[PDB]
Amino acid sequence: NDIQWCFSQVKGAAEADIISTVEFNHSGELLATGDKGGRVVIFQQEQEHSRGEYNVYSTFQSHEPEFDYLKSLEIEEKINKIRWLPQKNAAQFLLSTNDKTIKLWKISERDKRPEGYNLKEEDGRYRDPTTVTTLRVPVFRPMDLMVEASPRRIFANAHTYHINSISINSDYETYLSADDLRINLWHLEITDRSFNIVDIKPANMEELTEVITAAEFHPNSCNTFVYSSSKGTIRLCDMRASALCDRHSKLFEEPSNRSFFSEIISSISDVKFSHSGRYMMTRDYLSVKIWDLNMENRPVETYQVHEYLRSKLCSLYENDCIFDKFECCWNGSDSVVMTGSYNNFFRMFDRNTKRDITLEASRENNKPRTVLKPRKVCARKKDEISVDSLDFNKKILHTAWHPKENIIAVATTNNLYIFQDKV
Amino acid sequence: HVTRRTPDYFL
Amino acid sequence: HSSRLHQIKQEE
Amino acid sequence: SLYPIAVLIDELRNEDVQLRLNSIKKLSTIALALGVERTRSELLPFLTDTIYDEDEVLLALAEQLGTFTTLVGGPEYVHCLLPPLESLATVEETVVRDKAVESLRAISHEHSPSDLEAHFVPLVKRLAGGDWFTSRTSACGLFSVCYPRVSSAVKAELRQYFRNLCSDDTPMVRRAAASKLGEFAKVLELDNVKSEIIPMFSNLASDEQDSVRLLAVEACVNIAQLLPQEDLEALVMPTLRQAAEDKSWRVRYMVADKFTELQKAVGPEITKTDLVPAFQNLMKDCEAEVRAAASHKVKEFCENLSADCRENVIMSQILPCIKELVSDANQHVKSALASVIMGLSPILGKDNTIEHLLPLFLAQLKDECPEVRLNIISNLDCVNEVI
């Protein structure tokens, strides 16, 4: 039943180095990570199923720090989201965003260079032009392989608030970007204008009650996208109905836990369509809920990430941990969903069996093909970990599942862990 | 720049 | 204090 | 006196895009000095697949390669220009591919019929069957130029290849196939248009992607002009009716946007039976974009109606809808009418203009929006000659 996960790799070791996003490409051969420093590092799998290891493939500075003179505020270069485009040609393309700007990056391999000059040597040593009589055209010669990353398009100035989501449409033309109150629709080849399809900004900010937390396009349907709010609801929009999507087609929400923190913990941090697109998953602070898109009034499945914290919310509020934005992800077949927790724990929920396992991303097990031991938390029998001993600074916010294989990328604050199915 | 009228690329 | 909604109200 | 040429050739390696761009624009001078034989063997292989890939530099390179037929030795060696253009027809930038395809179409006319089947048609097959959908997208635009001048056996292969593109997994390719479907049908024999084009046209018109279906409206206009009027009811009209009722407002917008073009193609008889009910629905569309698009076509649509029923149809069917549009909530829908409503006066005459049109003119002149009032005032020329 349970997948026997094994340590495969650890990469990394400073604030700038903290990983802020992890994303496999569509084929799964490339893995991208962003950090608070604005740097993108791409790892390529060795292709000598496939269980080859991932090695640094490209590295570039996606975003630079900038100052908003108009409002006298610094702009973080932190990379919030990375999204790969479907492979157009030999090159690779990904969208990279920070709070304000989305950049389209082309990553391409080059293995040849021009050679030959008329008026000088390769060394740069010039010669008298008077003696130059016969022309010669330069010829391309092989060179050691290198990978170059260049920014092809900049999508800037369109968002007043902080970008939280980018999502590519299935039509291969457009993608959305969502800040706290607006969702804008872009054409991948047009930077000078964008279409604001959703705007929940109230007339008077004193009356503000909801902010957008995440937005995603349906994997198959070109006209369907969802966005979630801080109030814990998900609105499904139909672009066919009308040009502007201020009217949702469906609203997903649930009707003894009415604590002071109920308003905080209910905020949805991440929403993910299943690969099939029939189910939708949302992560809030304490639970993962899976929605059938045909059932608005309640989820079909609910999983508790960490119940032992439900009594400690007071402490978590006092150290700001309660506002952590955890993510979730489906596996390729949509049978297992993975989400992170504290103390470098990450949680696997198998839908078919309804079984749980808790795994730890730690260097103590830094031996390849060594099986990870399931963890148990107790509020203490043999091998159980006390709740009070959990380190809340060790947060696994960002995780990524290989599109086809049982390979997962789990990012701690500083280190990126890669785990594989025992083979 | 950002408009609520449908741009040409989406019409 | 740390709520994203609160930050927006303060800012604007 | 070859020193200036040497500077240009070396500048092709220069890091400065502007200097490198300048040399590319002067490739004709470089090729002219080098010679016909050297150009084929030395210059083109350097240009076949360049590492420098600025959109402006590649776009300039694609333009130049379309005029190199004389520099490469004339039509006898025109096929030497294919490899450089085949590379440019694969890049990620859309305009560069569009320019490269344009140049390929230009030099195709200079290929002899033997050369087409020997060098050009194989190029189309490589692009059409390529692993990268950029190449397959480019291939869609090359079928129409090589199809007319090839043997029947080659023609059958080309139609099969075009059919595969219409069924591609990637929407980007299917959009290109839908866009070029009209012009490919124009070169096909009428028998194959009915047998092969229509099934592809029907499939693309019911595609899952909205962006693909809306392109079928353009194909509808082109195919309708090719078929005899008697065959429109069986082959074209069933698809056209679905488009007007399509759930996507984007598809209905295209029908409204190209309604007069459809009117000419189908003919007066089909217009009365099918288009007039369709136009009424578009004017009452839930989406303001569709209603505004239909409002622009009110004058042209009414003008083209056959005189046997023009005035009666306008008064009984079209005019009631216009009254609702005058009071439309959307500012842009009302502005669209104001610029064309005055043009119905010559059609209806003085008596009808005063009794029916004039109240609408007064209503729009009292509208709060300045744009609506300005539009009415700007188009008083037609009304003055009638009343």
Author numbering:
A (entry chain B): 8 to 20, 26 to 60, 66 to 272, 276 to 399, 403 to 446
B (entry chain C): 299 to 309
C (entry chain D): 81 to 92
D (entry chain A): 9 to 395
Relevant lines from the article:
Inhibition of PP2A:B55 is achieved by the intrinsically disordered proteins ARPP195,6 and FAM122A7. Here, we report the single-particle cryo-electron microscopy structures of PP2A:B55 bound to phosphorylated ARPP19 and FAM122A. Consistent with our complementary NMR spectroscopy studies, both intrinsically disordered proteins bind PP2A:B55, but do so in highly distinct manners, leveraging multiple distinct binding sites on B55.
The interaction of FAM122A with PP2A:B55 is different to that of ARPP19, with FAM122A residues 81–111 binding PP2A:B55 with two helices. Helix α1 (the B55-binding helix) binds B55 and helix α2 (the inhibition helix) binds PP2Ac and blocks the active site. The FAM122A B55-binding helix binds the B55 platform, with its N terminus pointing towards the centre of B55 and its C terminus pointing towards PP2Ac. Residue R84F forms intramolecular polar and ionic interactions with Q87F and E91F that stabilize the helix. Finally, E92F binds a deep, basic pocket below the B55 platform where it coordinates residues from L1/2, L2/3 and L3/4. The key interactions between B55 and FAM122A are mediated by FAM122A residues R-L-X-X-I-K-X-E-E, four of which (R84F/K89F/E91F/E92F) are highly conserved. Mutating the basic–hydrophobic residue pairs—that is, 84RLHQIKQEE92 to 84AAHQIKQEE92 (84AA85) and 84RLHQAAQEE92 (88AA89)—reduced FAM122A binding by 1.6- and 2.0-fold, respectively.
